Design a protein around this ligand. Structure first.
Ligand SMILES: CCCCCCCCCCCCCCCCCC(=O)OC[C@H](COP(=O)([O-])OCC(O)COP(=O)([O-])OC[C@@H](COC(=O)CCCCCCCCCCCCCCCCC)OC(=O)CCCCCCCCCCCCCCCCC)OC(=O)CCCCCCCCCCCCCCCCC
Ligand SMILES: CCCCCCCCCCCCCCCCCC(=O)OC[C@H](COP(=O)([O-])OCC(O)COP(=O)([O-])OC[C@@H](COC(=O)CCCCCCCCCCCCCCCCC)OC(=O)CCCCCCCCCCCCCCCCC)OC(=O)CCCCCCCCCCCCCCCCC
Ligand SMILES: CCCCCCCCCCCCCCCCCC(=O)OC[C@H](COP(=O)([O-])OCC(O)COP(=O)([O-])OC[C@@H](COC(=O)CCCCCCCCCCCCCCCCC)OC(=O)CCCCCCCCCCCCCCCCC)OC(=O)CCCCCCCCCCCCCCCCC
Ligand SMILES: COC1=C(OC)C(=O)C(C/C=C(\C)CC/C=C(\C)CC/C=C(\C)CC/C=C(\C)CC/C=C(\C)CC/C=C(\C)CC/C=C(/C)CCC=C(C)C)=C(C)C1=O
Ligand SMILES: CCCCCCCC/C=C/CCCCCCCC(=O)OC[C@H](COP(=O)(O)OCCN)OC(=O)CCCCCCC/C=C/CCCCCCCC
Ligand SMILES: CCCCCCCC/C=C/CCCCCCCC(=O)OC[C@H](COP(=O)(O)OCCN)OC(=O)CCCCCCC/C=C/CCCCCCCC
Lengths: 75, 119, 123, 269, 59, 74, 73, 75, 62
């Protein structure tokens, strides 16, 4: 119990890995949005909406991990 | 008096009266709220009301009694200790002179002798 | 070898004492912090001195500071001072609560006149 | 005609000790500022009571402080069983109407009290005792009948039960007397002359060593060699003591459909 | 190698680390509280294994 | 659990620490059972003293006035 | 001034002498050993028995006799 | 027990991984912003706002990570 | 007040009193006389500031 609990909490730390990749994926996404905006600013709002939209797919994995994290942390 | 670290809760609940209080074990969670460093042995935390007593000492050593002891983690220990020994003193007396009030006592609902059944 | 001190045992004969030392020594588990030792333990090194909870000086000094006005007084002076207070039931004791709670109403008089321009900022 | 001051006023020497239990920087800094201007501050509230002015209790930020109620497992469910454990949380969570109701007396203790018998019934009892010590018991019939008639029946029941209780306590105290005054096998034939000239301090840690290895520096110079030799001596004594072992008894609680005996639990599971 | 090459070595050590009381005792020993042990205290882990349903002899 | 401070004092918790093992720690609890029965019996041998020493008899007819506390309604 | 005389009764002295005997008696009580047995207070039992035997009669039907101004708790 | 506390503080260190990816993600974001600005400097203000906005989303993961860390460190 | 002068001693043992107020570890590295250099040196520092008073009249600064 306490022995397995120790590795349980350790696994919960692993959930901070997507938190890292999600940040990099964000920095990369907005970079493409900026450079792409310069090439064709006529559709700024379109690009802008798709940018945040894509970001929503990043925090998707985030909450999924944390959810799976606390789950196995107690299940 | 209790001559052990553990006691059956049902033995300190009333059988013919409403149960509005229990005799709970020491609250070990309050021991983790002390911010300062201290040494506590696990062999002294189960005996009734003694943990709250040692905590009060630890808090009265780190802090004093004026303007620094007055923090929630230290006052609750002093209140628990003072309250624990009062409740345990009354329950102990009630167990000494009113054992028929509690569950598990053979006098709360006496079982009759076979001579009283008329067979 | 066994060391002697002020704290003595509770045995009449010397054989019972030696039997007690042999029982305790047979249970000792040495934990050394130095490599190349048959009994080596980097972590989980057992301490060899027992801790005892005692009231410190800050403890005993504050309990004595609570009784400072009683050491200068006699028992008859203490009773006449703190116990036999002359009865006087003419004071408005509850003025403390009236002033405190009545200040909410007085404070509302001054606070309702704030020069804040936006109505929703005063909200 | 100066107002009277309580003992607590001489410890602090002021009526305005701004004691706040909330240990946040904003609170303790404001209290130190408020504690210094309390002499000339209109927004000052007393916390040390006096004969002329009441006082407030301990402050918790803007609200008031009260200790966490002593843990009580008694609770009452409304929607679903909550399995409330007072030891699972530090501070007791508030009671929601649809979740739980806690037991009465957040700050209460267990005491024993007694009702005060009616005044006229008391005067009849005083007259009986008075006529008893003066004229004797045999000449107190009229005073005894006045008691049975004037005292309401609920009082006579109390008087009847007091005698049965004190009769019960009298036996409970004498049984303890018998167990206390019993002479054990290890004190047969021993009297005050065989007592040692020792006091309580002689059984303390300074004079009487506890049953622990690291209470003092007794076993600090022991080597692994001396240990291996000691393990051989204790095993030698066991060549004569292990010859005996208590026999296994029958399990009185073998039948699960039978009220089990509250037998002493094993040290370990 | 003897510890890894064994079958029960993992259990005798795991069942000991899982018993919260035996670890509480060790935590006291590390702080300086130690004494002698009886034959019944020495088997505190065997009682824990038996409770789980293990087949342990020599109590 | 009555006689708390008396029992805690007899066990030595004011100067030392209990054994860290349940076998001996529990035997030390049962060792004071005789002393508690003794110290409790001693406390029940106190001789009487006049009740009318620090307390006026409330059953005296002088107190039949049932007087109230006069106050000022500030 | 009416009830000052009650402090001159010998029962006040008898009450204080009993309180001091219990103080000196409990001051002599001591732990004799640390074997975790009732024999650790072997000599103290004799001391307290002498105190009880000094204010009671063990060879009676009820050594502790009830009186309304006595001790029950 | 004691080891459970040790792995907790160990996990708390793992939170420094998103702190690392957030740094790289930020540099990449500003790297594209520079090239993006050179492509269409007429909308420097728009690109600039989008740059900091994306970075704000990166620090979200950061506060989310340390938050989880301090939580698992004390819960 | 006489009993207030002894408050830090009632909380201590004789051995603690000696190690506290008598057996102070020797350390002769401190500039103890800095207390006077700061005080008396202030007259010079104060003069540097006071000699710049914007009082117009010369005899007023006198
Ligand atoms: C998901 C993938 C990614 C994850 C990757 C990483 C995962 C990490 C999480 C951990 C995984 C599980 C392993 C935990 C092992 C337990 C460790 C421990 O608690 O220390 C105690 C442990 C023993 O303490 P001790 O001082 O010997 O006790 C002496 C007393 O006299 C003892 O007497 P006593 O009376 O006081 O008794 C005390 C009581 C205390 O009881 C307890 O506290 C319980 C302890 C928990 C474990 C108990 C269950 C063990 C069951 C056995 C099965 C082990 C399987 C391991 C599987 C590994 C998975 C691949 O009982 C014990 O002593 C328990 C003994 C513990 C033995 C642990 C098993 C040894 C493993 C053998 C393999 C060694 C490989 C080393 C490789 C290193 C590479 C860097 O300490 C050490 O082992 C010291 C380290 C080894 C010596 C060499 C120095 C190495 C330094 C490495 C530095 C780098 C650290 C890592 C850096 C990583 C980032 C770069
Ligand atoms: C020549 C020109 C002037 C040059 C001089 C300029 C400098 C003047 C200042 C120096 C002299 C002041 C004289 C009095 C000494 C006060 C010293 C002091 O430290 O007081 C701090 C004083 C008390 O400190 P405290 O212990 O923390 O108590 C306040 C706590 O809230 C209390 O919390 P609590 O829960 O413990 O208690 C609740 C409280 C109820 O407390 C509350 O409800 C207030 C809660 C705050 C509002 C809620 C929102 C939270 C806001 C937080 C952010 C606020 C930031 C403000 C920062 C200000 C920094 C100072 O109720 C009570 O406890 C009892 C209150 C009622 C007692 C009786 C009061 C008698 C006052 C007599 C008034 C006499 C003047 C006439 C008034 C005007 C007539 C037209 O704090 C204040 O600043 C109070 C502000 C109230 C507004 C005053 C507005 C009128 C001012 C009149 C100035 C003179 C006349 C001007 C004429 C116009 C032409 C010039
Ligand atoms: C943003 C703009 C600013 C807005 C802020 C506005 C508010 C400004 C004030 C608040 C901030 C002050 C900063 C320092 C904290 C002081 C707090 C405090 O409580 O001090 C009270 C302080 C101590 O009170 P005290 O216990 O009575 O000690 C004086 C006794 O005389 C002592 O007599 P004694 O016998 O007991 O002892 C003899 C004494 C020696 O005492 C004397 O001999 C002096 C006696 C005075 C002359 C005798 C004639 C006196 C006639 C009586 C009437 C005099 C009225 C003067 C009223 C002046 C009101 C300030 O020697 C000593 O004890 C030790 C002296 C060695 C100290 C070395 C200096 C350390 C100070 C820090 C240096 C760095 C500061 C910057 C350097 C200066 C700027 C370049 O009172 C004084 O300050 C006395 C005035 C001394 C001149 C100071 C003028 C400095 C003004 C600087 C303003 C800021 C810079 C301006 C830049 C402009 C562009 C923005
Ligand atoms: C390198 O080439 C050379 C020259 O240049 C060509 C020469 O001129 C010379 C000739 C030398 C001279 C002409 C110099 C002559 C100077 C002499 C003889 C000594 C002069 C002494 C004084 C004027 C008295 C000074 C007294 C004080 C400073 C004490 C009063 C002031 C006090 C107490 C303030 C406290 C001062 C400090 C803490 C020092 C820190 C310095 C500051 C500037 C802080 C100032 C602070 C404030 C608030 C103003 C040589 C030999 C040379 O080698
Ligand atoms: C111009 C005057 C107009 C007044 C109004 C007209 C009608 C007057 C009616 C007079 C009725 C008098 C009957 C007696 C009432 C008794 C009042 C009373 O009991 O107060 C007691 C008590 C005294 O305290 P103790 O020492 O404990 O009691 C000793 C008793 N000898 O008085 C108090 O409660 C204190 C508060 C008094 C009233 C409120 C004071 C504040 C008045 C607000 C306006 C002042 C604003 C300016 C204040 C300056 C602040 C910096
Ligand atoms: C004044 C010269 C400054 C520039 C000089 C440059 C050359 C530097 C060459 C230095 C060589 C080193 C030689 C050794 C220096 C010895 C210094 C010394 O004796 O005094 C040290 C001693 C340390 O104290 P202790 O704890 O007792 O000693 C512990 C020793 N470990 O320092 C002092 O005496 C304290 C005072 C130091 C000088 C203070 C400067 C005064 C100027 C005041 C204005 C500063 C602003 C004040 C603002 C106040 C705001 C509240």
């Amino acid at each position: 119990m306490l022995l397995v609990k120790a590795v349980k909490v350790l696994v919960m730390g692993g959930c901070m890995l997507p938190i890292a990749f999600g940040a990099l994926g964000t920095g990369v996404l907005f970079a493409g949005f900026n450079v792409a905006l310069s090439r064709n600013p006529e559709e700024t709002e379109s690009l802008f909406n798709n940018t945040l939209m894509g970001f929503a797919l990043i925090e998707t994995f985030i909450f999924m991990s944390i959810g799976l994290g606390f789950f196995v942390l107690f299940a | 008096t209790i001559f052990a670290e553990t006691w059956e809760a049902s033995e300190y609940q009333y059988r013919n009266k409403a149960n509005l209080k229990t005799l709970p074990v020491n609250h070990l969670g309050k021991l983790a709220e002390l911010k300062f460093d201290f040494v506590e042995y696990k062999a002294h935390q189960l005996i009734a009301c003694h943990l709250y007593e040692r905590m009060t000492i630890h808090c009265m050593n780190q802090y004093g009694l004026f303007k620094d002891f007055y923090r929630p983690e230290c006052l609750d220990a002093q209140y628990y200790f003072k309250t624990c020994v009062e409740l345990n003193a009354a329950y102990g007396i009630q167990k000494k002179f009113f054992p028929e009030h509690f569950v598990g006592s053979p006098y709360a609902r006496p079982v009759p002798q076979f001579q009283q059944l008329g067979l | 070898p066994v060391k002697e001190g002020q704290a003595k045992l509770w045995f009449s004969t010397k054989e019972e004492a030696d039997a007690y030392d042999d029982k305790m020594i047979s249970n000792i588990e040495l934990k050394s912090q130095d490599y190349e030792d048959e009994n080596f333990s980097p972590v989980f090194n057992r301490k060899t001195q027992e801790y005892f909870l005692e009231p410190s000086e800050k403890f005993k000094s504050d309990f004595a500071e609570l009784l400072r006005p009683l050491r200068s007084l006699s028992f008859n002076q203490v009773v006449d001072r703190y116990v036999l207070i002359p009865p006087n039931h003419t004071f408005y004791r509850n003025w403390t609560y009236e002033k405190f709670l009545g200040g909410f109403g007085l404070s509302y008089l001054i606070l309702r006149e704030l020069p804040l321009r936006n109505f929703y900022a005063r909200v | 005609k100066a107002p009277g001051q309580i003992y607590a006023y001489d410890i602090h020497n002021t009526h305005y000790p701004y004691v706040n239990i909330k240990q946040d920087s904003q609170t303790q800094l404001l209290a130190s500022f408020r504690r210094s201007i309390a002499s000339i501050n209109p927004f000052s509230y007393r916390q040390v009571p006096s004969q002329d002015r009441a006082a407030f209790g301990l402050r918790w930020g803007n609200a008031w402080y009260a200790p966490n109620p002593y843990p009580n497992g008694i609770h009452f469910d409304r929607v679903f069983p909550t399995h409330y454990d007072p030891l699972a949380e530090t501070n007791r969570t508030k009671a929601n109407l649809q979740l739980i109701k806690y037991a009465p007396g957040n700050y209460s203790t267990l005491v024993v009290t007694s009702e005060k018998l009616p005044r006229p019934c008391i005067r009849t009892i005083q007259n009986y005792r008075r006529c008893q010590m003066v004229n004797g018991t045999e000449k107190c019939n009229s005073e005894a009948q006045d008691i049975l008639a004037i005292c309401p029946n609920w009082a006579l029941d109390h008087m009847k039960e007091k005698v049965r209780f004190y009769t019960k306590a009298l036996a409970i105290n004498n049984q303890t007397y018998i167990r206390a005054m019993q002479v054990e096998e290890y004190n047969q034939g021993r009297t005050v002359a065989d007592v040692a000239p020792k006091t309580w301090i002689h059984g303390t840690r300074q004079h009487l060593r506890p049953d622990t290895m690291w209470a003092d520096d007794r076993y600090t110079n022991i080597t692994q060699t001396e240990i291996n030799e000691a393990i051989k001596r204790v095993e030698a004594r066991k060549a004569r003591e292990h010859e005996k072992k208590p026999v296994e008894q029958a399990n009185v609680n073998a039948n699960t459909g039978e009220q089990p005996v509250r037998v002493e639990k094993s040290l370990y599971p | 190698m003897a510890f890894l090459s064994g079958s029960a070595t993992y259990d005798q050590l795991a069942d000991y680390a899982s018993y919260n009381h035996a670890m509480d005792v060790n935590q006291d020993q590390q702080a300086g509280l130690d004494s002698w042990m009886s034959e019944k205290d020495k088997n505190m882990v065997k009682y824990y294994q038996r409770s789980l349903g293990k087949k342990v002899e020599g109590i | 659990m009555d006689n708390y401070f008396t029992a805690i004092t007899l066990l030595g918790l004011r100067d030392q620490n209990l054994p860290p093992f349940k076998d001996a720690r529990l035997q030390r609890y049962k060792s004071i059972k005789k002393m508690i029965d003794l110290i409790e019996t001693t406390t029940k041998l106190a001789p009487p003293m006049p009740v009318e020493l620090f307390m006026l008899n409330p059953t005296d007819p002088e107190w039949d006035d049932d007087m109230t506390y006069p106050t000022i309604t500030h | 001034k009416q009830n000052e005389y009650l402090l001159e009764h010998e029962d006040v002295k008898r009450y204080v002498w009993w309180y001091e005997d219990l103080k000196e008696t409990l001051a002599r009580v001591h732990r004799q050993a640390n074997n975790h047995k009732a024999c650790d207070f072997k000599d103290s039992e004799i001391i307290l028995q002498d105190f009880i035997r000094r204010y009671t009669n063990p060879k009676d039907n009820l050594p502790i006799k009830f009186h309304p101004q006595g001790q029950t708790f």
